[PDB]
Amino acid sequence: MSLNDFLSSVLPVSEQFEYLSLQSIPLETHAVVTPNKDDKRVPKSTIKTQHFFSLFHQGKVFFSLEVYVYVTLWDEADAERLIFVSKADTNGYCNTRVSVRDITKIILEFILSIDPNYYLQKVKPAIGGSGFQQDLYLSFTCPREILTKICLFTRPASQYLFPDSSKNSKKHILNGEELMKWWGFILDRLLIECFQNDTQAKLRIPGEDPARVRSYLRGMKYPLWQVGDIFTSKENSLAVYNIPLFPDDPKARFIHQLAEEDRLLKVSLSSFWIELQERQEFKLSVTSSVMGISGYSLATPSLFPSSADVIVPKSRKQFRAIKKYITGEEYDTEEGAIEAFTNIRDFLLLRMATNLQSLTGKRE
Ligand SMILES: CC(=O)SCCNC(=O)CCNC(=O)[C@H](O)C(C)(C)COP(=O)(O)OP(=O)(O)OC[C@H]1O[C@@H](n2cnc3c(N)ncnc32)[C@H](O)[C@@H]1OP(=O)(O)O
């Protein structure tokens, strides 16, 4: 089941769309969570990859989604993958009704189906060794059926990927409560459609008492949602030794604040959640939540994405240039959505002899 198949299954019947599915070259990086000295085993390697998606309709971009996948290796038989859902955004320049919810769900379903070995086949080394040889890549193997985590932080903003798109009166911005429920629905469906019944499913709303969190969870179809998170309680539950540090994420932003305050050894997980809320509070306060899934896939992931599924630029420079045509554009008028589409289409054609992928919706 290709990305084309997945997207078509949730797009309106007989309607035409195009997509960009862009991916960075997998890179050896530091651990997701800050290591400690008391860990009897630390990761042998952590491999980070970015997937960046844009959907187009009628020659205009209207939706984008940024996802990072981390594969952490302890040895040949011991690995985990984590999908960090970073940013989802719209600009309101789609002239037809689509379910952005289902688009987002289905792209994550596609990512879950990818064999983690796909990211391990050709890994760019971290600078700290390997040395002078320029075209040297690492390769690893792991089992296909590995522990799979998904993490995201819900927090609304006028935009994340489409500058000034809130100036478009057609843009639909969810408030913090609606946005939590929206992502809640998406993850609930991923659990039911893609995860085994023994899976951890966690929700917390920083700064709030669990009673109200528990209230919401009662409407989920996955039967094992709990209030809390998927994080460990290493080192007397110090936040620094248990909180994953993700790109542009509020948790990492607050960890770095504690670092600047010299309090990383003073702040427990419980205080972290209170303070994360506390000290960004009044006029900018909106409902934020942290969601976590940890378990095994129902179907063993064995797909190595084709060129139709993903475009992997030969360099970070090319990757950056293409993504910037989306994120560096101005969307106060529809001309931004048109320009993003034309720039991307021309760049792909001119520099890569590639087309955006065409889709016809199949959903009745
Ligand atoms: C991890 C993270 O990324 S958190 C950050 C999330 N991103 C942002 O906050 C950026 C700003 N927000 C947005 O871009 C959007 O509001 C999104 C992406 C969150 C959701 O987009 P939407 O277009 O609202 O999504 P979707 O198609 O799923 O529709 C959701 C609901 O809004 C309704 N809706 C959609 N468009 C409109 C509209 N123009 N006017 C009124 N209602 C609308 C739909 O009917 C649906 O209603 P239902 O729940 O009663 O069925």
XYZ file of C-alpha atoms in Angstrom, residues 17-222:
206
model
C -4.480 16.432 -5.932
C -0.670 16.358 -6.003
C 1.755 15.694 -3.186
C 5.328 16.328 -2.266
C 6.883 13.758 0.061
C 10.372 14.978 0.883
C 12.934 13.210 3.062
C 16.339 14.078 4.506
C 19.294 11.694 4.326
C 19.280 9.662 7.595
C 21.917 11.033 10.001
C 23.658 9.601 13.034
C 22.876 11.926 15.958
C 22.864 12.201 19.796
C 20.367 10.227 21.895
C 16.717 11.323 21.964
C 16.775 11.528 25.793
C 19.841 12.916 27.613
C 21.981 9.921 28.768
C 22.958 9.383 32.390
C 26.026 7.764 34.006
C 23.959 5.098 35.804
C 22.559 3.564 32.630
C 23.953 0.048 32.321
C 23.295 0.286 28.563
C 23.229 3.376 26.307
C 22.307 3.507 22.591
C 24.967 2.295 20.188
C 23.467 4.650 17.629
C 20.559 7.023 17.017
C 19.549 7.687 13.408
C 17.369 10.726 12.675
C 15.352 11.303 9.509
C 12.904 14.057 8.569
C 9.843 13.451 6.413
C 8.217 16.640 5.071
C 4.896 16.444 3.197
C 2.895 19.021 1.247
C -0.474 18.528 -0.446
C -1.543 20.642 -3.457
C -4.890 21.181 -5.160
C -5.443 23.164 -8.341
C -1.865 24.427 -8.531
C -1.709 25.690 -4.940
C -0.164 24.215 -1.790
C -2.732 24.025 1.050
C -1.384 21.634 3.729
C 2.011 20.577 5.105
C 3.236 18.150 7.752
C 6.674 17.726 9.335
C 7.571 14.390 10.962
C 10.878 13.093 12.355
C 11.689 9.431 12.729
C 14.365 8.332 15.193
C 15.696 4.775 15.149
C 17.660 3.957 18.312
C 19.892 0.911 18.273
C 21.219 -0.950 21.292
C 22.494 -3.910 19.277
C 21.734 -6.158 16.276
C 18.582 -7.554 17.912
C 17.552 -4.508 20.074
C 16.009 -1.384 18.588
C 13.167 1.115 18.901
C 11.676 3.606 16.493
C 10.024 6.862 17.454
C 7.836 9.021 15.266
C 7.793 12.639 16.406
C 4.902 14.498 14.795
C 6.332 18.019 14.801
C 4.080 20.451 12.899
C 0.859 20.229 10.897
C -0.489 23.362 9.163
C -2.949 24.619 6.541
C -3.141 27.939 4.740
C -6.843 27.916 3.762
C -6.185 28.007 -0.040
C -7.947 24.760 -0.905
C -11.142 25.343 -2.873
C -12.633 21.971 -2.035
C -13.615 20.174 1.184
C -11.006 17.697 2.403
C -10.514 15.976 5.765
C -7.134 17.271 6.982
C -7.629 14.980 9.977
C -7.744 11.851 7.771
C -4.958 13.115 5.476
C -2.753 13.483 8.578
C -3.824 10.077 9.945
C -3.102 8.345 6.642
C 0.347 9.896 6.197
C 1.271 8.635 9.695
C -0.100 5.188 8.724
C 2.192 5.289 5.729
C 5.195 6.210 7.911
C 4.316 3.356 10.388
C 4.463 0.856 7.464
C 8.056 1.732 6.624
C 10.603 -0.949 7.584
C 12.941 0.684 10.141
C 15.818 -0.911 8.164
C 15.003 1.538 5.391
C 16.616 4.310 7.463
C 19.603 2.117 8.405
C 20.804 1.190 4.926
C 22.877 4.331 4.256
C 23.434 6.624 7.255
C 25.429 9.849 7.188
C 27.984 9.656 10.019
C 28.144 12.281 12.754
C 31.133 14.551 12.202
C 32.927 13.232 15.336
C 34.298 10.372 13.262
C 33.905 9.122 10.631
C 36.750 11.270 9.190
C 38.099 12.417 5.813
C 36.395 10.163 3.208
C 33.483 12.174 1.806
C 31.210 9.479 0.414
C 31.328 7.157 3.426
C 28.024 5.955 4.885
C 27.215 3.737 7.832
C 24.809 0.804 7.614
C 23.006 -1.115 10.327
C 20.324 -3.756 10.659
C 17.572 -4.324 13.227
C 14.403 -6.510 13.394
C 11.418 -5.279 11.371
C 8.978 -5.674 14.292
C 10.350 -3.217 16.812
C 8.896 -1.178 19.644
C 7.270 1.829 18.013
C 6.656 5.140 19.784
C 4.760 8.206 18.614
C 5.063 11.546 20.407
C 3.453 14.894 19.848
C 2.757 18.163 21.644
C -0.589 19.802 20.833
C -0.551 23.594 20.890
C -2.398 25.843 18.451
C -0.815 28.831 16.699
C -2.001 31.077 13.837
C 0.615 29.170 11.736
C 3.673 26.876 11.872
C 4.597 26.246 8.219
C 2.675 28.953 6.278
C 3.761 32.520 7.250
C 0.856 34.985 7.599
C -1.730 32.433 6.435
C -4.068 33.478 9.303
C -4.656 36.609 7.177
C -6.571 34.328 4.804
C -10.140 34.463 6.047
C -10.604 30.900 4.759
C -8.000 29.443 7.116
C -9.603 27.355 9.854
C -7.692 27.633 13.161
C -8.602 25.116 15.905
C -8.540 26.405 19.483
C -6.446 24.443 21.999
C -9.272 22.190 23.171
C -10.491 21.352 19.643
C -6.901 20.738 18.565
C -6.294 18.278 21.418
C -9.463 16.380 20.460
C -8.437 16.423 16.801
C -5.066 14.834 17.434
C -6.775 12.556 20.024
C -9.066 11.193 17.310
C -6.129 10.668 14.917
C -4.071 8.734 17.485
C -7.088 6.729 18.663
C -7.558 5.580 15.022
C -3.850 4.765 14.622
C -4.071 2.597 17.735
C -7.150 0.722 16.517
C -5.948 0.388 12.912
C -2.197 -0.111 13.362
C -1.224 -1.218 16.910
C -1.496 -4.380 18.966
C -3.879 -4.491 21.904
C -1.131 -4.407 24.489
C 0.007 -0.854 23.568
C 0.583 2.148 25.906
C -1.563 5.163 24.983
C -1.006 8.260 27.130
C -2.374 11.783 27.437
C -1.471 14.592 29.784
C -2.439 18.234 29.941
C 0.450 20.015 31.711
C -0.572 21.945 34.745
C -3.971 20.271 34.964
C -5.268 17.791 37.487
C -5.674 14.271 35.961
C -9.465 14.158 36.685
C -10.342 16.233 33.637
C -7.802 14.425 31.452
C -9.431 11.104 32.497
C -12.831 12.553 31.604
C -12.019 13.012 27.933
C -10.263 9.620 27.608
C -13.606 7.834 28.318
C -14.779 8.542 24.726
C -11.765 6.859 23.046
C -12.289 3.545 21.174
C -8.789 2.176 21.969
